[PDB]
């Protein structure tokens, strides 16, 4: 929740925590990567390298 005091967003985030007068808790880092699906990993026991 904003503090009592004031409500003030930036409408595309922000890099810096501290600005022109305030400081702010840092923005969480982008997501990013991917997935691969097949067969071959159907592993169940014993030594599995991959």
């Known amino acids: 929740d ?8 930036w ?19 982008a997501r990013l990567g991917c997935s691969i699906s097949s067969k071959l990993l159907k592993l169940s026991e014993g030594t599995r390298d991959i």
């Open 11 to 29: 409408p595309f985030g922000y890099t810096k925590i501290c600005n022109a007068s305030t400081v702010l808790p840092a923005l969480p880092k």
């Open 2 to 9: 904003f503090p009592k005091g004031s409500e003030k967003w």
